[PDB]
Ligand binder design. Sequence first.
Ligand SMILES: O=C(O)[C@H]1O[C@@H](O)[C@H](O)[C@@H](O)[C@@H]1O
Ligand SMILES: [Cl-]
Length: 302
Amino acid sequence: DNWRGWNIHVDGYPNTVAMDKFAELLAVKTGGEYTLQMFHGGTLGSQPDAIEQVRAGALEIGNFNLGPIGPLVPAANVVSLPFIFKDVPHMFRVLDGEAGKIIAAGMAEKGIQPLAWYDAGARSFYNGEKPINTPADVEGMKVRVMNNELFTGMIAELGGNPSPMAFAEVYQALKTGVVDGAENNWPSYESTGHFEVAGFYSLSQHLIIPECICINIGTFNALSDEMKTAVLEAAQESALYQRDLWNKREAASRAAVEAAGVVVNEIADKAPFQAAMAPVYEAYFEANPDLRPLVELIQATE
Ligand SMILES: O=C(O)[C@H]1O[C@@H](O)[C@H](O)[C@@H](O)[C@@H]1O
Ligand SMILES: [Cl-]
């Protein structure tokens, strides 16, 4: 009845405050029959490890980015395709439609039930050496990515050298030059300290990946109908709050790092970055023929 949950983020981060709210709302709506203890800051382990713990039932709850879920769940892997959404509002429109049900089904199929969707904005490149404006600027650059071969591909097609690595280890790696750069949204770039050791941020906005509040499906299925309704309502309400927190944080984060001296650039012509992803998309299609229509469905959505 007393659950444990994972979140990788630090204090005050939108996801952190929102998962606390999820835990609070779970206890309220279930009259104390179900409670949740959060372990924030990744103190329970890396994201892939936590995903395995939730799937195995060693942990009940996670706030997981879908990036590291992709290698486990083909349908979820669709949101890890570079340049598949035009922007965050587009993503949410796609997720509240048929794409979302398919992604959820695929997830539930691998033992992990999404309960609500969180915003994590768009991810963009950052490094300590120079601005990125064209794919040529990425050639030879060692860029850290999350643990998903779609992202190793993305970097290789821009001529970089990908380095999949745990999020926790990125600050040191940038500090010592083991990697040259990485990529993420404004709040992560700011909260982890990466901006202090990688002060060029280039708005490629190459990935727009949602997150979820995740529950082990056995845990969820064992609930009564009314408790499932309570858990879903808590999750959904936490996520609406998270989305409000998120939009204020993106601006505050961006402003704080610009003030600290970060040099920001837009990418005027993103088209060559997109064009270079042909082989990554085509290589997902070859691995997952059945899911070509999921990709087309998303790209067809306004
Ligand atoms: O880059 C990463 O590993 C991290 O990126 C952040 O944006 C996600 O919120 C976090 O779940 C990931 O662990
Ligand atoms: Cl990680």
